[PDB]
């Protein structure tokens, strides 16, 4: 019952891999301690192979099926549509992996005869054959990190044409079903502001609250054949088209339950009998399965009035405290129940009695005050990885503009404001590329964002508060200042002076650039300005952004 089977054929790269941090003329103005930033190469694969390969034992009790019965009752109310070849195509990222059958993401998007005809052929094959496994490619992910070295994380994905077909059958399912099944617990519906709003309102809803995060070790590898089959039965509860029922049935048996692994060179690396990293249903499946096992463990553990938040594999449980000795006991029962459902933790879960001490998705809640002195809750994180990736992106132009994702995800934070905005606007001005749109991958999907749109984007994701925050927690300020010392990043005082300049430079540019100057760098001035909401913000079409998450989803959005 192993998560993976292997042959001995190595996981081979598709290109040349740079491990050591590239050095520009701009590099030293951001990060001086270069020997601390590295990128994971395919050389590291053999170590992840070991970690992600283990046997899984599942013991399903009455709490599991009781919760499943309920999830299916909600699922039965969902009606989902079969996406047109044209709709799924228009949802393909432009720099998505090409097909082995002579067409690319650009071909797919422009609706080329060659591309359209193959998608039609793969779809037909899906409807006629429900048993032949579908091949997948195994790739080592080249991600940037800081010291104190991780091995290369792995991505399993099917051919371009299968990804278009997954979208036709399940894009509407993954979009509408999880909120119906999980309610306010489906994390992927919330904008960062909506999420902080949810946790606080939830933390407050409890007379005496206790919360904890639960992180399963290699969650993808803990997902079993029953788990994947159980998810299919949730999808099949929807009112679907017969063509969608068959295609979902086919994709499950032939791709989702598992299949063979192949490298870039095309050698059989082995077999997968667990969750694929690069399938549409990764984010959605992991959310439903994590919620199902967690909900059932709460019952098992007898946790009092538990509200939870599920985001893929990241889980947070906020419940009514029964007492410190009781909560800590209840927690070990939760872990024991979880373990039985084949989802044990990496490090054990700790009960927390302060919302600001729970960490999930590498983030935690913090406080600052808006212009009028009012306490404002925002999500923050340790700036170490965002800053090390920003240093990598200072010298190398990447398909993922980590820093732009970071600015969009963490606009109200001290560090995103003072360092990421300041540094990258300085670069954009120098290169005259403020108006040049950038594809940026955020925790799944790909977004085409024009930097000039950051003020209006931020206002709709965080509010005007983000441009007015001050009086940050000392704990936050110290986490940031220690990180800057660790990485050799100039002190925050240096960034306020540079920001005054970038601000002045943006204002002298007029229009949208001056709107970027006025709003993003208003913290830098002593003689502040009282900001108003931006007219263009309400006119931005953010439909389909936060309806759901799409891990290996291969989903694209534009403005």
Instruction: State the minimum distance, in angstroms, from the CB of residue 409 to ligand 9VY.
Output: 3
Instruction: State the minimum distance, in angstroms, from the CB of residue 293 to ligand 9VY.
Output: 14
According to DSSP, the β-strands at 136-140 and 259-262 are parallel
> Is the Cβ–Cβ distance between 260 and 270 less than 8 Å?
yes
Q: Is 313 annotated as a binding residue?
A: yes
3-state secondary structure of 447: strand
Token pair in block for residue 207: 């007379």
> Is the Cβ–Cβ distance between 164 and 89 less than 8 Å?
yes
Strand positions, DSSP E, 50-190 = 136-140, 144-146, 154-157
Query: Which is nearer to ligand 9VY, 473 or 501 (by Cβ)?
Result: 473
Which residue, among 153, 122, 351, 145, has the nearest Cα to 250 in the 3D structure? Answer: 122
Query: How far is it, in rounded angstroms, from Cα 381 to Cα 424?
Result: 19
Instruction: State the minimum distance, in angstroms, from the CB of residue 188 to ligand 9VY.
Output: 6
Specify the DSSP element, H or E, that contains 199.
helix 192-205
Query: Which is nearer to ligand 9VY, 85 or 469 (by Cβ)?
Result: 469
Instruction: State the minimum distance, in angstroms, from the CB of residue 454 to ligand 9VY.
Output: 12
Query: Which is nearer to ligand 9VY, 345 or 444 (by Cβ)?
Result: 444
Residue with tokens 């190469």: 41
Query: Which is nearer to ligand 9VY, 136 or 185 (by Cβ)?
Result: 185
Query: Which is nearer to ligand 9VY, 97 or 309 (by Cβ)?
Result: 309
Query: Which is nearer to ligand 9VY, 263 or 366 (by Cβ)?
Result: 366
Token pair in block for residue 467: 């441009």
* Residues at the contact surface with ligand 9VY, assessed by CB under 6 A: 187, 192, 195, 199, 309, 311, 314-316, 358, 360-361, 363-365, 379, 408-410, 442-444, 461, 545, 549
Q: Is 314 annotated as a binding residue?
A: yes
Query: Which is nearer to ligand 9VY, 13 or 549 (by Cβ)?
Result: 549
Query: Which is nearer to ligand 9VY, 297 or 309 (by Cβ)?
Result: 309
Residue with tokens 């002190």: 491
Query: Which is nearer to ligand 9VY, 253 or 314 (by Cβ)?
Result: 314
Q: Which own/partner pairs from 434-439 qualify as long-range (CB within 8 Å, at least 24 positions apart)?
A: 434/509, 434/512, 434/513, 434/516, 435/512, 437/559, 438/401, 438/404, 439/93, 439/94, 439/95, 439/399, 439/401
Instruction: State the minimum distance, in angstroms, from the CB of residue 405 to ligand 9VY.
Output: 8
Work out the number of other CB atoms within 10 angstroms of the CB of residue 274: 26
> Given strand 259-262, what is the order of strands in its sheet?
4-6, 268-272, 259-262, 136-140, 154-157
Instruction: State the minimum distance, in angstroms, from the CB of residue 559 to ligand 9VY.
Output: 12
Query: How far is it, in rounded angstroms, from Cα 41 to Cα 139?
Result: 10
Give the 3-state secondary structure percentages of the chain, helix then strand then coil, rounded to 5: 50, 15, 35
Instruction: State the minimum distance, in angstroms, from the CB of residue 509 to ligand 9VY.
Output: 26
Instruction: State the minimum distance, in angstroms, from the CB of residue 557 to ligand 9VY.
Output: 8
Q: 333 — phi, psi (to 5°)? A: -65, -45
Query: How far is it, in rounded angstroms, from Cα 254 to Cα 276?
Result: 12
Instruction: State the minimum distance, in angstroms, from the CB of residue 363 to ligand 9VY.
Output: 4
Q: ∠448-450-453 over CA atoms, to 5°?
A: 120
Instruction: State the minimum distance, in angstroms, from the CB of residue 198 to ligand 9VY.
Output: 8
Query: How far is it, in rounded angstroms, from Cα 254 to Cα 237?
Result: 20
DSSP string across 21-36: PP--SSGGGT-S-GGG
Query: Which is nearer to ligand 9VY, 237 or 409 (by Cβ)?
Result: 409
Work out the number of other CB atoms within 10 angstroms of the CB of residue 42: 20
Summarize the annotated binding site as residue ranges: 215, 313-314
Summarize the annotated binding site for Mg(2+) as residue ranges: 215, 313-314
């Amino acid at each position: 019952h192993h998560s993976y089977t292997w042959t001995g054929a190595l996981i081979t790269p598709c290109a040349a891999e740079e491990s050591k941090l590239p050095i520009n003329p701009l590099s030293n103005s951001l990060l001086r301690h270069h020997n601390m930033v590295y990128a994971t190469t395919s050389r590291s694969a053999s170590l992840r192979q070991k970690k992600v390969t283990f046997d899984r034992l599942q013991v399903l009790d009455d709490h599991y099926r009781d919760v499943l019965k309920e999830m299916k009752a909600k699922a039965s109310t969902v009606k989902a549509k079969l996406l047109s070849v044209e709709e799924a195509c228009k949802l393909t990222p432009p720099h998505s992996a090409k097909s082995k059958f002579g067409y690319g993401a650009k071909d797919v998007r422009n609706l080329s005869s060659k591309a359209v005809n193959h998608i039609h052929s793969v779809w037909k094959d899906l409807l006629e054959d429900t048993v032949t496994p579908i091949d997948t490619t195994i790739m080592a992910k080249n991600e940037v990190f800081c010291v104190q070295r991780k091995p290369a994380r792995l991505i399993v994905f099917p051919d371009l044409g299968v990804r278009v077909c997954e979208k036709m059958a399940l894009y509407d399912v993954v979009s509408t079903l999880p909120q119906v099944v999980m309610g306010s617990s489906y994390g992927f519906q919330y904008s960062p502001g909506q999420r902080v709003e949810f946790l606080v309102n939830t933390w407050k809803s409890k007379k005496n609250p206790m919360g904890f995060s639960y992180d399963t070790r290699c969650f993808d590898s803990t997902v079993t054949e029953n788990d994947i089959r159980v998810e299919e039965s949730i999808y099949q509860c929807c009112d679907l088209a017969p063509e969608a029922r068959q295609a979902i049935k086919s994709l499950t048996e032939r791709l989702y339950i598992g299949g063979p692994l192949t490298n870039s060179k095309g050698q059989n690396c082995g077999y997968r009998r667990c969750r694929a990293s690069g399938v549409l249903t990764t984010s959605c499946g992991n959310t439903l399965t994590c919620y199902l096992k967690a909900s059932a463990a709460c019952r098992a553990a007898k946790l009092q009035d538990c509200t939870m938040l599920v985001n893929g594999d990241d889980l947070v449980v906020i419940c009514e405290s029964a007492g410190v000795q009781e909560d800590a006991a209840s927690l070990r029962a939760f872990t024991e129940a979880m373990t039985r459902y084949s989802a044990p933790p990496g490090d054990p879960p700790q009960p927390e009695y302060d919302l600001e001490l729970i960490t999930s998705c590498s983030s935690n809640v913090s406080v600052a005050h808006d212009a009028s002195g009012k306490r404002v809750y925002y999500l923050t994180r340790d700036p170490t990885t965002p800053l090390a990736r920003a240093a990598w992106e200072t010298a190398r132009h990447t398909p993922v503009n980590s820093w732009l994702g970071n600015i969009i995800m963490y606009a109200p934070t001290l560090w995103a404001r003072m360092i990421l905005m300041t540094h990258f606007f300085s670069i954009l001005l120098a290169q005259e590329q403020l108006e040049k749109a950038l594809d940026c991958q955020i925790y799944g999907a790909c977004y085409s964002i024009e930097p000039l749109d950051l003020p209006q984007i931020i206002e709709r994701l965080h509010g005007l508060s983000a441009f007015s925050l001050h009086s940050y927690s000392p704990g936050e300020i110290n986490r940031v200042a220690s990180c800057l010392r660790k990485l050799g990043v100039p002190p925050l005082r240096v960034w306020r002076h540079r920001a005054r300049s970038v601000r002045a430079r943006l204002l002298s540019q007029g229009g949208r650039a001056a709107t970027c100057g006025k709003y993003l760098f208003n913290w830098a001035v002593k003689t502040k300005l009282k900001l108003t909401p931006i007219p263009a913000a309400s006119q931005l079409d953010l439909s389909g952004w936060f309806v759901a998450g799409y891990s290996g989803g291969d989903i694209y959005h534009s403005l």
